[PDB]
Amino acid sequence: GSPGENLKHIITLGQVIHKRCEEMKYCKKQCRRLGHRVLGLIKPLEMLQDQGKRSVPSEKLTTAMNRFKAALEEANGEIEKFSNRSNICRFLTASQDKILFKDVNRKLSDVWKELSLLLQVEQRMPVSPISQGASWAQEDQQDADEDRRAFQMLRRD
Numbered sequence: 703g704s705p706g707e708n709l710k711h712i713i714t715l716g717q718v719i720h721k722r723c724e725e726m727k728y729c730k731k732q733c734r735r736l737g738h739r740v741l742g743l744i745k746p747l748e749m750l751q752d753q754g755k756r757s758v759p760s761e762k763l764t765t766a767m768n769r770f771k772a773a774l775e776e777a778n779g780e781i782e783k784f785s786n787r788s789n790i791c792r793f794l795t796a797s798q799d800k801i802l803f804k805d806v807n808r809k810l811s812d813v814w815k816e817l818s819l820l821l822q823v824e825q826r827m828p829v830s831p832i833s834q835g836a837s838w839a840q841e842d843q844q845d846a847d848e849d850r851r852a853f854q855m856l857r858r859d
C-alpha cells in the first residue's frame with residue numbers, strides 16, 4: 703500500500719540523527735559534521751514531501767528507498783550505542799585510530815546514488831555532483847581523530 707509513514711520515518715531518520723548529535727558528548731565532534739553533512743542527502747528528500755511536487759513513487763523507487771531506510775538506520779543506531787563512554791573507550795582502545803561512522807557514509811551514499819539515479823533520470827533532485835567526489839569520506843577520518851586527542855582528557859591514565 704501507500705500509507706506514507708514509510709517515507710516519514712525514512713526522511714525524519716536524517717533529522718533525528720542530526721539533532722541527536724547534540725546529545726553526544728565525546729563523538730559530538732564528528733557527529734557535528736556527520737549529521738550536518740549527511741543532512742544534505744535528506745535535504746532534497748524532505749523537500750519532495752514538503753513542496754509536494756514529485757508525484758507518488760513507484761515500486762522501482764520503493765525498492766531503492768527501502769534499502770536506504772535500513773541503511774541510514776545504521777548511523778542513527780551507531781551514534782546511539784556510541785553515546786556510552788564504555789562503547790567509545792572499548793572501541794578506541796580495541797583498535798588504533800579508526801572511524802566510527804565511516805561505513806555509514808559509504809552505505810548512505812551507495813544506497814543514495816542507487817535510488818538517486820532513477821530519481822534524477824526524470825528530474826535531478828540534488829545539485830552538486832553526488833556521484834563523483836569522495837572527499838567528504840576522507841574528511842571523516844580527520845574528524846574521528848579529534849575524538850582521540852579529546853578523549854585523553856576524558857580520562858587520565
Ligand SMILES: CC(C)c1ccc([C@H](O)c2nc3ccccc3[nH]2)cc1
Binds near residue numbers: 704705709760764821
Ligand atoms: C523521496 C521520494 C522519492 C520517496 C517517497 C516515498 C517513498 C516510499 O518508500 C514509497 N512509498 C510508496 C508507495 C507506493 C509505491 C512506491 C512507494 N515508495 C520513497 C521515495
